[PDB]
Each structure stands twice: as structure tokens, then as C-alpha cells.
Amino acid sequence: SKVTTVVATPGQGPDRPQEVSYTDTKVIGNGSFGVVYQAKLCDSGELVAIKKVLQDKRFKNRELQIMRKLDHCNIVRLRYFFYSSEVYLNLVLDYVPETVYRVARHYSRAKQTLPVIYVKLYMYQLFRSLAYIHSFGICHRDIKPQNLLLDPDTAVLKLCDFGSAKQLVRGEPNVSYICSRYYRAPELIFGATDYTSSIDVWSAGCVLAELLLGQPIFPGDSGVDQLVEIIKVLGTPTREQIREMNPEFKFPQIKAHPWTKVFRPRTPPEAIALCSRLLEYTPTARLTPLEACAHSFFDELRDPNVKLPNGRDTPALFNFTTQELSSNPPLATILIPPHAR
Numbered sequence: 001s002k003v004t005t006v007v008a009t010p011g012q013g014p015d016r017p018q019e020v021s022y023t024d025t026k027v028i029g030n031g032s033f034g035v036v037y038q039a040k041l042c043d044s045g046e047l048v049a050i051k052k053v054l055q056d057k058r059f060k061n062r063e064l065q066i067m068r069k070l071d072h073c074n075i076v077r078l079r080y081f082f083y084s085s086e087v088y089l090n091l092v093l094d095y096v097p098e099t100v101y102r103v104a105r106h107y108s109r110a111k112q113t114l115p116v117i118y119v120k121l122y123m124y125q126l127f128r129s130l131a132y133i134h135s136f137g138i139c140h141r142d143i144k145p146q147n148l149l150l151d152p153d154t155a156v157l158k159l160c161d162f163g164s165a166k167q168l169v170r171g172e173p174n175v176s177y178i179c180s181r182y183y184r185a186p187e188l189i190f191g192a193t194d195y196t197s198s199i200d201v202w203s204a205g206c207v208l209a210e211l212l213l214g215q216p217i218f219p220g221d222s223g224v225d226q227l228v229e230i231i232k233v234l235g236t237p238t239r240e241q242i243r244e245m246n247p248e249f250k251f252p253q254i255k256a257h258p259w260t261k262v263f264r265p266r267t268p269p270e271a272i273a274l275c276s277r278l279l280e281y282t283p284t285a286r287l288t289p290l291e292a293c294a295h296s297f298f299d300e301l302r303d304p305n306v307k308l309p310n311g312r313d314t315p316a317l318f319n320f321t322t323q324e325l326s327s328n329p330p331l332a333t334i335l336i337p338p339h340a341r
């Protein structure tokens, strides 16, 4: 009700703060960082989330520094940011009301399967945001279904939560206990710290596969139990596999559970061939997010007529930028279909 008025710097553009007014603040989430609110900007009527972190006062916020570099339609945009209170950094973000987690669980609670057309849309917009994120050498490191925001009506997916993303410095090592356990790549559990952006892709597989199965593919009861779960679907990792993951542990030996069966009968051939492609031991083996997009599974989305179950056209899926294409520029004719040139 009470309209709060702050002095806020636009997320992008020149550092020139404006008076921004918002009201109807309610809490919609919280964690170690702090709290997320939903508010209504008084002047555009538009809804926003406000992530209230806690700023090390005498330290530069990594998330803030990362959000500013970022403008992509499948990523929650940092519209503004301000400070308040000792001292809290506030990120004013796009609000989107649903998450893949919550959608995936409604289906699962009702023992149905999320329509493959939604799996496609959502996974594609996910590989997109990462192709973009990774082109800057920024690893998300918490790719999990509740960091995927969805618009029920328009089928837009926006990646959110960069509260543990990092500009990866090759030659520079990092922390290995990151990601949500179920979505955490094997090398991470192995103690690797020399890792790459492939870890995000493993998380995507973990998602892809959970959308298909209606439950987490690898559900460990702890950091270490996690690898036991991966193991029972892929088997054990071998020389160049463990090599590739990290240059200790103590587990048991198990056989390679065939893919085209880890799921259910009606599951599409390409989706299965996707995961097998993602969910891979060696990290150089996992496909690239851009390269992922390319792969068949998403072909239906390259069909000129495709529409949303509710008869609307698909959200804008081909508005690529060269910044977005940077990684692998020679592959547009198979990512941009004619009808969008």
C-alpha cells in the first residue's frame, strides 16, 4: 500500500540515478543473500521483483557487476538497482510469476507429463540464455528448475538468480561445492576447481531429463551420495573420464545403464539423444549450449507455423545477436530459419 520512493541507478546505460516509486511490496522468497519481493512500479504499473541482498559495504558485489553486463530476453533483466537500510544492495528485476519447478511438479503431482512442446520451448530458451551467458565467459553455476522463470500465457522463459554466477578466469580455479546437488556435475563432486562452463550444460541435461521423467534423474541424499546416483545411470567413469574431470575418493563399480531406456517408452528419440549428449562424464564431451539448440530435438520450433497450445505464436526465438552467436558464428542457417530474416 505505502508507496516507497528510492533513488535508483538504471541497470544499463549511464550511471545516473532516478527517483523510482513502487508499492505493494510482498515477500516472494528468501535465502542466504537476503530476500526477494514483488512490487508494482507506480508509474508503469509494471510488476517487478526486488532482490534485497546485503552488501559487504567495503566490497564490490559480483552479482550486481554481472547483471549490468547483461541484456537478453531469456534472462531476468536488471532494470534498476539501489541501496538501503547496515547496507543492502537492491536489484530491481523483471518479475515473471511461474517457475519450471512448480510447473514440472503440478504435472508430476497429477501424474501426467509436461507436453514435449513445452519441454522444447523451455530447454531452447534455456540453451539460449547460456550460449549468451557463456559467450561472456560467465558461468551460472546454479542451473536448476527453480531458477527458470516462466510466463504461463506467453511461454517465455527467463533465467534468474546470478547470486553464484562467476566470470570464469581460465588459469584461475574455483569452488567445487556449488550448484544444487541434483544438478551438480560429476567433476564438481569430484573436487575439481579447474572447471568450465560445461557444468551448466550438465545442469541443463539434469533439467531436460527431469522434465522427461517427471522427477530428478540423479537424486542423492547428500553431496557424496549424489555421485552414487549419477553412477547408477551412466556406470563408472574411466581413466580419461576421471582424468577429464580433474587431475582420493572411494566408490563401488557399476555397469552402463543404456540410455534409450532410462526413461519411458513414449519419450522422443532426439530428447534421449540430447541428454546422452549433455549428461556426459568428460566435460569437454558435453555439447555447447549453442550447439545444443542446433540439435534436432528443437526442430519443431524451427517450423514456420508452430504455435503455443493456446493458439498464440511462440515467443521470439530467433532474434539472435552476433554477441549471442559469437561462440560459433558459422551455424546461423541452421538456427535462423528463413521466415525470420
Ligand SMILES: Cc1nnc(-c2ccc3occ(-c4ccc([S@](C)=O)cc4)c3c2)o1
Pocket: 028, 029, 031, 036, 048, 049, 051, 076, 093, 094, 095, 096, 097, 098, 099, 102, 146, 149, 160, 161, 162, 163
Ligand atoms: C534468488 C533469486 N535471484 N533472483 C530471483 C528472482 C528474480 C526475479 C523474479 O521474478 C519472479 C520471481 C519468483 C519468485 C518466487 C517464486 S515462488 C518459489 O513460486 C517464483 C518466481 C523471481 C525471483 O530470485
